[PDB]
Structure 1
Amino acid sequence: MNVNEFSNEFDVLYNNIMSNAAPGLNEYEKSVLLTKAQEEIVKNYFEPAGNKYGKGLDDSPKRQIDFSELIKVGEGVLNTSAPTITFDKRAKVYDLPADLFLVINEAVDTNAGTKQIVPISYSDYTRLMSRPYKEPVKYQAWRIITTSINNISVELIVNSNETITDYKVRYIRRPAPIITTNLSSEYGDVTINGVSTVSECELNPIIHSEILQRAVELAKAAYQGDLQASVELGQRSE
């Protein structure tokens, strides 16, 4: 469904049938609520505990097809542009793509073959570095986030006497906002995520109805406006 259909069925589901009908929502408000509902839905469906099914990214066909249009593959750029201080002397710093929402798969291609990057926790890092070896298992590499400015910088730890040729990252692209109409105005240009032009929902049509329902629920919680509704509907932001 295109943006006009988002807005028309938003109006239908919000106030065109309600008995003591409420004021219609302005297009900026509808775009804001739709973008919020989109992000909430993405976060709810990525995490199993966030939805009533207990199903995350790839726990069912529907969850695969939900994020299928939001998956992207890119590469981390070696961060030798400027000097820096790494926590580990034997780690190579890489910069992830700017439009990164969530990392789901990483791999590094070295001279000793491809290796799956395992994101190790800080307590896990301490445990592993208290051991005599201090290097990954055969077909794996280690990873920790380092000092990041304006984009995520990442330290890749591989086994000794190994060089990294490329660093691929299969991630979830940051969703683009849903903007119903050109938000340009003479009184001031308002933006949802830095863009005023019309922006279609760049995800699969399977969850457009879900985004619409969530947006309507958020609109009605805003209309109710007491602390109660804000608190319970803020639980699903996550």
Structure 2
Amino acid sequence: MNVNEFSNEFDVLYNNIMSNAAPGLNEYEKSVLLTKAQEEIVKNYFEPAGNKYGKGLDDSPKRQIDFSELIKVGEGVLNTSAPTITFDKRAKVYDLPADLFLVINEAVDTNAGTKQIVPISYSDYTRLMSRPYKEPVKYQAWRIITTSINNISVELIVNSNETITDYKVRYIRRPAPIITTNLSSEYGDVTINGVSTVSECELNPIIHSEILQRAVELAKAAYQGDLQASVELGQRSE
């Protein structure tokens, strides 16, 4: 649905059926609530335990088509510009894309061959580095996060005697804001995520109705509810 359609259907669901019988809502507030709603739906439908069906990203076709228009494949760039300090001796620091929301598949192309990357935990690192060999398996590579400055930097711990030629990242792109009107017209200086103009939803139409309903519930809780409503509806914010 278009942003105008978003606003009109939002005023048909909230505001009763366009009766002007509930707290009047501005376009900036509607844009804010729609943005919050789309982040909430993304975070709830990625994590299987956040929704009611118990299904995550690729557990059903519906979730696949939901997250389809956010999947992005990008290459990581070497962070040799900054001579920072690494935690591991054989770690090549790489910078991830800026519009990164969630990583789901990462791979590295070495001289030996392509090796799928395994995100290792802080405990698994200590467990596997207390052994004789202290290297990954033949067909995998390790990755841990390190010092990052207004970005995401990752330590690529690949087996020694090898070189890294490419670092591909299939990640969920950060959703763009949902803005119904140019906010600079009526309002002095207000933004949603650094944007002031109209911003169409960069998602599949599948979850647009869900976003609208979640925004309606958020508006109802905030503008017609008490502390209990806010606390109860903040549970579904993660």
For structure 2, the 5+ residue unaligned runs are none
Moved more, 48-57 or 15-24: 15-24
Preserved CA contact (<8 Å) 1:115 1:141: yes
Moved more, 221-230 or 135-144: 221-230
Taking structure 1 as reference, are residues 186 and 10 closer, same or farther at Cα in structure 2, changes over 3 Å only? closer
SS in structure 2 at match of 1:81? coil
User: For 2:150 and 2:44, how far apart are their aligned partners in 1?
Assistant: 25
Q: TM-score, structure 1 length as denominator? A: 0.97
* CA RMSD across the alignment: 1.2
TM-fit CA distance, 1:24: 2.3
Matched, 1:175 2:180: no
TM-fit CA distance, 1:224: 2.4
Preserved CA contact (<8 Å) 2:3 2:178: yes
- Aligned counterpart, 1:110: 110
Q: TM-score, structure 2 length as denominator? A: 0.97
Moved more, 25-34 or 11-20: 11-20
Taking structure 1 as reference, are residues 186 and 179 closer, same or farther at Cα in structure 2, changes over 3 Å only? closer
User: For 1:139 and 1:183, how far apart are their aligned partners in 2?
Assistant: 51
TM-fit CA distance, 1:56: 0.2
Preserved CA contact (<8 Å) 2:116 2:139: yes
For structure 1, the 5+ residue unaligned runs are none
Preserved CA contact (<8 Å) 1:86 1:146: yes
User: For 2:203 and 2:17, how far apart are their aligned partners in 1?
Assistant: 28
Q: How many residues align?
A: 238
TM-fit CA distance, 1:223: 1.4
Taking structure 1 as reference, are residues 20 and 100 closer, same or farther at Cα in structure 2, changes over 3 Å only? closer
Moved more, 8-17 or 181-190: 181-190
Preserved CA contact (<8 Å) 2:12 2:18: no
Preserved CA contact (<8 Å) 1:11 1:24: no
User: For 2:185 and 2:10, how far apart are their aligned partners in 1?
Assistant: 23
Deviations 1:152-203 (A, max 9, x none): 1000011111000010000000000000001113651210000001000000
Taking structure 1 as reference, are residues 193 and 77 closer, same or farther at Cα in structure 2, changes over 3 Å only? same
User: For 1:187 and 1:233, how far apart are their aligned partners in 2?
Assistant: 29
Preserved CA contact (<8 Å) 1:177 1:193: yes
Preserved CA contact (<8 Å) 1:108 1:115: yes
Preserved CA contact (<8 Å) 1:4 1:180: yes
User: For 2:153 and 2:88, how far apart are their aligned partners in 1?
Assistant: 14
TM-fit CA distance, 1:16: 4.1
Alignment of 1:68-79 (within 5 A): 68-79=68-79
Preserved CA contact (<8 Å) 2:35 2:178: yes
Moved more, 44-53 or 221-230: 221-230
SS in structure 1 at match of 2:156? strand
Taking structure 1 as reference, are residues 63 and 26 closer, same or farther at Cα in structure 2, changes over 3 Å only? same
User: For 2:187 and 2:58, how far apart are their aligned partners in 1?
Assistant: 46
SS in structure 1 at match of 2:178? coil
Preserved CA contact (<8 Å) 2:11 2:18: no
- Aligned counterpart, 1:190: 190
The share of aligned pairs that are identical, in percent, is 100
Deviations 1:6-36 (A, max 9, x none): 0000000011427781132100000000000
Moved more, 116-125 or 20-29: 20-29
Moved more, 222-231 or 129-138: 222-231
- Aligned counterpart, 1:214: 214
TM-fit CA distance, 1:42: 0.2
- Aligned counterpart, 1:199: 199
SS in structure 2 at match of 1:29? helix
User: For 1:109 and 1:235, how far apart are their aligned partners in 2?
Assistant: 41
